[PDB]
Assembly symmetry: D2
Homo-oligomer: 80 residues x 4
């Protein structure tokens, strides 16, 4: 018994995200996570500023892990 | 933001439940748990015979713990 | 924002389940549902008559719908 | 008979919040909501700017409604 899940309000890519297309990426997290779907949210490299905005297109759970596929809709402080 | 919760489908009272009225009890669990509300579910003393059926009337989270108030709607193998 | 989900404790196949292998099936539900993972639960044709027991191996969300892949571990009243 | 809940990442007080002490308020929402606990989040009057930061101290569910008690830790654009 006991179905544990984690609710996330932000996409934090530890530089481990993978692009499968032009603006859509995939991120694999440990544990069963719940991410707002179709809703725009903040994306960042580290838990600590803002790297951009994105919207999860798909979310799946399998073997204690969760992998999301999101569409990056904008970049924040893009230097230079 | 790393908000962990546990989903429970059954009420497991380690004999630590407290009755506040005639058929309604209160159970305190460790961690923020999610219990089906207004929905009837099984209640047992341990992981090892159905003790009855109940329905959560109230659920609260506070200081890493969760305390529920349920209404016992029936008893199972009530021995003589 | 507002991220709505539904917590299910049982697998109710309206006869709309599809087997992709020998004992593993796939069921598509409306809305983003949360099902206990790796945990055994009851499976029935309708909300009325247990058909068997199963365990969800994978769960995914996409376009307001949820599709689960479960492994049937046993059959209940298998008539002859 | 599913168990529907809504995940919120921000406190949106439609001007319907009530203070029970000096810096702690209480907000009643429709539906069973899940709010990050002990974790600081943004608070605003409407879904439109930032009114301050707060941290939920208690959360309860009862009769399809949810009422939270949060501690306001700071004010944003406090005019004058």
């Amino acid at each position: 018994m006991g179905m544990p899940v984690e609710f996330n309000t932000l996409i934090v890519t530890k530089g481990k995200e993978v692009r499968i297309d032009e603006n859509i990426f995939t991120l694999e997290k440990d544990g069963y996570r719940v991410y707002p779907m179709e809703i725009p949210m903040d994306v960042r490299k580290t838990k600590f500023e803002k790297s951009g905005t994105a919207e999860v297109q798909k979310l799946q759970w399998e073997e204690g892990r969760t992998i999301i596929t999101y569409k990056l809709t904008s970049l924040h402080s893009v230097n230079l």
